[PDB]
Amino acid sequence: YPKLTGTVIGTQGSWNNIGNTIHKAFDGDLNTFFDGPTANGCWLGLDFGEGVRNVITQIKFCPRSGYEQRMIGGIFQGANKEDFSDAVTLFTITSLPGSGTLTSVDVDNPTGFRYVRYLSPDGSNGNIAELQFFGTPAG
Ligand SMILES: OC[C@H]1O[C@H](OC[C@H]2O[C@@H](O)[C@@H](O)[C@@H](O)[C@@H]2O)[C@H](O)[C@@H](O)[C@H]1O
């Protein structure tokens, strides 16, 4: 299934205002990463757009090099409300992701979502180098 496109959404700003914003997780470079402005609460994802819903069949991600531990416990969610109050967890990261590569995980949830995100665990500053969603328009 193809890589899904959308509008990047999530935590605004970056650590020490250096500029490593959420957009660095979608730029195709595994060397660039999102470094959030706070230790906790950081998240990033996509809005596929009004009236657009995709079924998610796979997620790929790559940790920030040297900070792979900061992804453990992170979750990926799908939702149809931008505040994620109706979210369901699509996958939970429970082991250390390999450095410098995209780890691919299958998703088995038939629901169509307008919104998807990665919700980072405490102490991570949202650290992630790259994030990709795959799937198909909801029937
Ligand atoms: O705390 C978030 C922060 O963690 C690392 O930096 C930790 C500290 O490193 C030190 O060398 C000092 O620069 C100190 O100011 C830092 O808090 C990451 O390298 C950084 O990007 C950021 O994620």
Ligand SMILES: [Ca+2]
């Ligand atoms: Ca990147």
